[PDB]
Design an enzyme around this catalytic site. Structure first.
Site, PDB file in Angstrom:
ATOM      1  N   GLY A  18       0.833  -1.198   0.000  1.00  0.00           N
ATOM      2  CA  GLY A  18       0.000   0.000   0.000  1.00  0.00           C
ATOM      3  C   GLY A  18       0.866   1.244   0.000  1.00  0.00           C
ATOM      4  N   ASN A  19       0.228   2.406   0.122  1.00  0.00           N
ATOM      5  CA  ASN A  19       0.967   3.663   0.213  1.00  0.00           C
ATOM      6  C   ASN A  19       1.732   3.792   1.526  1.00  0.00           C
ATOM      7  OD1 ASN A  19      -0.923   4.707  -2.194  1.00  0.00           O
ATOM      8  ND2 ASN A  19       0.778   6.167  -1.926  1.00  0.00           N
ATOM      9  N   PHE A  20       1.215   3.149   2.572  1.00  0.00           N
ATOM     10  CA  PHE A  20       1.857   3.113   3.889  1.00  0.00           C
ATOM     11  C   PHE A  20       3.226   2.422   3.850  1.00  0.00           C
ATOM     12  CE2 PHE A  20       1.572  -1.344   4.968  1.00  0.00           C
ATOM     13  CZ  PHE A  20       0.520  -1.817   4.196  1.00  0.00           C
ATOM     14  N   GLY A  21       3.379   1.458   2.946  1.00  0.00           N
ATOM     15  CA  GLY A  21       4.562   0.604   2.901  1.00  0.00           C
ATOM     16  C   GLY A  21       4.164  -0.834   2.623  1.00  0.00           C
ATOM     17  N   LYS A  40       3.989  -4.765   9.878  1.00  0.00           N
ATOM     18  CA  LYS A  40       3.707  -3.596   9.053  1.00  0.00           C
ATOM     19  C   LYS A  40       4.906  -2.622   9.068  1.00  0.00           C
ATOM     20  CE  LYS A  40      -0.064  -0.323   8.298  1.00  0.00           C
ATOM     21  NZ  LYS A  40      -1.318   0.210   8.898  1.00  0.00           N
ATOM     22  N   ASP A 127     -14.066  -0.123   9.990  1.00  0.00           N
ATOM     23  CA  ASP A 127     -13.563  -0.775   8.775  1.00  0.00           C
ATOM     24  C   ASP A 127     -13.809  -2.281   8.830  1.00  0.00           C
ATOM     25  OD1 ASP A 127     -12.404  -0.718   6.244  1.00  0.00           O
ATOM     26  OD2 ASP A 127     -10.351  -0.703   6.987  1.00  0.00           O
TER      27      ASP A 127
HETATM   28  C1  LIG Z   1      -0.938 -16.011   4.608  1.00  0.00           C
HETATM   29  O1  LIG Z   1      -1.539 -15.052   3.724  1.00  0.00           O
HETATM   30  C2  LIG Z   1      -1.961 -13.948   4.425  1.00  0.00           C
HETATM   31  C3  LIG Z   1      -1.811 -13.881   5.810  1.00  0.00           C
HETATM   32  C4  LIG Z   1      -2.236 -12.762   6.532  1.00  0.00           C
HETATM   33  N1  LIG Z   1      -2.044 -12.796   7.928  1.00  0.00           N
HETATM   34  C5  LIG Z   1      -1.961 -11.687   8.756  1.00  0.00           C
HETATM   35  N2  LIG Z   1      -1.994 -11.880  10.066  1.00  0.00           N
HETATM   36  C6  LIG Z   1      -1.927 -10.861  10.917  1.00  0.00           C
HETATM   37  C7  LIG Z   1      -1.806  -9.575  10.411  1.00  0.00           C
HETATM   38  F1  LIG Z   1      -1.759  -8.498  11.214  1.00  0.00           F
HETATM   39  C8  LIG Z   1      -1.774  -9.397   9.030  1.00  0.00           C
HETATM   40  N3  LIG Z   1      -1.674  -8.101   8.545  1.00  0.00           N
HETATM   41  C9  LIG Z   1      -1.693  -7.701   7.205  1.00  0.00           C
HETATM   42  C10 LIG Z   1      -1.126  -8.468   6.180  1.00  0.00           C
HETATM   43  C11 LIG Z   1      -1.160  -7.999   4.872  1.00  0.00           C
HETATM   44  C12 LIG Z   1      -1.759  -6.762   4.626  1.00  0.00           C
HETATM   45  C13 LIG Z   1      -2.292  -6.044   5.701  1.00  0.00           C
HETATM   46  N4  LIG Z   1      -2.249  -6.527   6.931  1.00  0.00           N
HETATM   47  N5  LIG Z   1      -2.904  -4.803   5.468  1.00  0.00           N
HETATM   48  C14 LIG Z   1      -3.214  -4.463   4.190  1.00  0.00           C
HETATM   49  O2  LIG Z   1      -3.757  -3.401   3.975  1.00  0.00           O
HETATM   50  C15 LIG Z   1      -2.892  -5.414   3.053  1.00  0.00           C
HETATM   51  C16 LIG Z   1      -4.133  -6.245   2.699  1.00  0.00           C
HETATM   52  C17 LIG Z   1      -2.493  -4.592   1.819  1.00  0.00           C
HETATM   53  O3  LIG Z   1      -1.797  -6.286   3.350  1.00  0.00           O
HETATM   54  N6  LIG Z   1      -1.844 -10.469   8.245  1.00  0.00           N
HETATM   55  C18 LIG Z   1      -2.838 -11.690   5.847  1.00  0.00           C
HETATM   56  C19 LIG Z   1      -2.994 -11.739   4.448  1.00  0.00           C
HETATM   57  O4  LIG Z   1      -3.559 -10.720   3.724  1.00  0.00           O
HETATM   58  C20 LIG Z   1      -4.078  -9.674   4.564  1.00  0.00           C
HETATM   59  C21 LIG Z   1      -2.546 -12.868   3.737  1.00  0.00           C
HETATM   60  O5  LIG Z   1      -2.730 -12.928   2.379  1.00  0.00           O
HETATM   61  C22 LIG Z   1      -1.597 -12.480   1.631  1.00  0.00           C
END
Ligand SMILES: COc1cc(Nc2ncc(F)c(Nc3ccc4c(n3)NC(=O)C(C)(C)O4)n2)cc(OC)c1OC
EC number: 2.7.10.2
Length: 268
Positions: A18-21, A40, A127
């Site tokens: 995302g734009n955040f990183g 993050k 959200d």
């Molecule tokens: C194992 O596959 C996956 C596992 C997770 N697990 C998981 N656990 C705790 C978390 F805090 C966490 N945070 C997270 C991660 C990614 C993100 C974001 N948050 N936020 C976003 O705005 C986008 C969505 C841009 O990318 N992910 C998440 C997946 O997608 C969220 C995924 O699919 C790739």
């Protein structure tokens, strides 16, 4: 809340952008064990968003809400959270269309419990959507993404504000007012999504068309194979008037009761 950068190991495998990183997978050395984490990592506003998010999660303590491990300043600002291995609820159900009915009820009920806790804690999520429900197992869901969340003032039951319009209550669109009841509205859209196996709500419609649709008393139809009792709860969540819409206490109870019926019937 502040973590030791040398105790943190990052993999180059990305979880999102995302734009955040970026969000990447990693490991953090706890007191004796190693804990798998989602991290993050930032690309002034972005930092203060991160710290606000961290400060919200720092206050929350519940089985059905993703835990924060802490924060870390190094190459960039980092927010280190516990890893949900199975990823987002919508993508999961899209990719596993044979998930059973009892199992969807079990997960959305788990979300109502997380949300009941958040209502009790006087925080608004703002959200709440299937993309922000992360699975630990096929039978264990947690609420994530608290970047838009707000601690409510002691004298008010609402917060006054790009918006995820399709998940938003009329009062949010019309008066910019976000309460736990408006979270209940999102929970209903979230329910529809889960029983539609991760389909986007209001398919093919722009935000303003959705607003016009709801204003006219129109609601999304019952998804294929959705028990009428669960579709009834969706509609009840979609109560126009904030004051008549149920809170999570009642919503969670309705789901609790119904899940135990389905659990009972299965044995018969
Ligand atoms: C194992 O596959 C996956 C596992 C997770 N697990 C998981 N656990 C705790 C978390 F805090 C966490 N945070 C997270 C991660 C990614 C993100 C974001 N948050 N936020 C976003 O705005 C986008 C969505 C841009 O990318 N992910 C998440 C997946 O997608 C969220 C995924 O699919 C790739």
């Amino acid at each position: 809340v502040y973590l030791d950068r040398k105790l943190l190991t990052l993999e180059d495998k990305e979880l999102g952008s995302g734009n955040f990183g970026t969000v990447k997978k990693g490991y953090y050395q706890m007191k004796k064990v190693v804990k798998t984490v989602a991290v993050k990592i930032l690309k002034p506003a972005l930092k203060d968003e991160l710290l606000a998010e961290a400060n919200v999660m720092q206050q929350l303590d519940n089985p059905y809400i993703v835990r924060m491990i802490g924060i870390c300043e190094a190459e960039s600002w980092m927010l280190v959270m516990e890893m949900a291995e199975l990823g987002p609820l919508n993508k999961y159900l899209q990719q596993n269309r044979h998930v059973k009915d009892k199992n969807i009820i079990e997960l959305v009920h788990q979300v109502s419990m997380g949300m009941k806790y958040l209502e009790e804690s006087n925080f608004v999520h703002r959200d709440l959507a299937a993309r922000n429900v992360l699975l630990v197992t096929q039978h264990y869901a947690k609420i994530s993404d608290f970047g838009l969340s707000k601690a409510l003032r002691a004298d008010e039951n609402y917060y006054k504000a790009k918006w995820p319009v399709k998940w938003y209550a009329p009062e949010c669109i019309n008066y910019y007012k976000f309460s736990s009841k408006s979270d209940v509205w999102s929970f209903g859209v979230l329910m529809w999504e889960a029983f539609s196996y991760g389909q986007k709500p209001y398919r093919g419609m722009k935000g303003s068309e959705v607003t016009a649709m709801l204003e006219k008393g129109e609601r999304m139809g019952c998804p294929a194979g959705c028990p009428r009792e669960m579709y009834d709860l969706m509609n009840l969540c979609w109560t126009y008037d904030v004051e008549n819409r149920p809170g999570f206490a009642a919503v969670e109870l309705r789901l609790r009761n119904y899940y135990y019926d389905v659990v009972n019937e299965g044995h018969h």
